[PDB]
Amino acid sequence: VPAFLGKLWALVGDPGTDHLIRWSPSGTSFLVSDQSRFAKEVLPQYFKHSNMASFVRQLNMYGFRKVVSIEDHVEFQHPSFVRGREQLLERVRR
Amino acid sequence: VPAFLGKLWALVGDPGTDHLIRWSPSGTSFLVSDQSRFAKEVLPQYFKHSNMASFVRQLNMYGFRKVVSIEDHVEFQHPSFVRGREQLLERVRR
Ligand code: NA
Ligand code: NA
Ligand code: NA
Ligand code: NA
């Protein structure tokens, strides 16, 4: 598992960050509650930078997608990024 | 499980419909490859109507969301609608 994805996995699951970034109730997507605060408060802890645009670009390079209503916060998803599915994470690729 | 969701579960998983509606590779979302054809060819088989707008409205009433790129076909998702997770399906509610 690439270091970016190992860090992403850890930071999403970390209870200490859940007020800003956490798994959905079933773990098939993850929620960033406040993008500005996430970039200033969580990203330095895990990546030693605070650049949301770089982070989102990296998610895009790995094929992550956004979850939106059929009809600031953001919800991301990847078929192979699922809480508890440690071996499936190996399928997330650039 | 409400009849709409039982039918949805069956039709997504049905190999005979997979050219038009199928689970994603990990089963955490589902893809409609061609909405017009899906409405004319799959919906009558399972619901005895051909109205895409009614179907999508029903998905919205149950809290389904759409999956889109970070930067016709459509991909839908619900935290509690996951291939193989039969008991989790009980949590999908109006
Ligand atoms: Na967690
Ligand atoms: Na977290
Ligand atoms: Na299937
Ligand atoms: Na199918």
From Swiss-Prot, chains A, B:
PTM summary from the entry reads: Phosphorylated mainly on serine residues. Isoform HSF4B is constitutively sumoylated. HSFA is not sumoylated.
Compartments it resides in: Nucleus
Consequence of substituting residue 70 to V = In CTRCT5; sporadic
**Signal peptide limits:** none
Physiological role: Heat-shock transcription factor that specifically binds heat shock promoter elements (HSE). Required for denucleation and organelle rupture and degradation that occur during eye lens terminal differentiation, when fiber cells that compose the lens degrade all membrane-bound organelles in order to provide lens with transparency to allow the passage of light. In this process, may regulate denucleation of lens fiber cells in part by activating DNASE2B transcription. May be involved in DNA repair through the transcriptional regulation of RAD51.
Q: Subunit info?
A: Homotrimer. Exhibits constitutive DNA binding and forms trimers even in the absence of stress. Interacts with ALKBH4, DUSP26, MAPK1, MAPK2, MAPK8 and MAP kinase p38.
Question: This protein is called what?
Answer: Heat shock factor protein 4
- Whose protein is this, by species? Homo sapiens
Q: Which gene encodes it?
A: HSF4
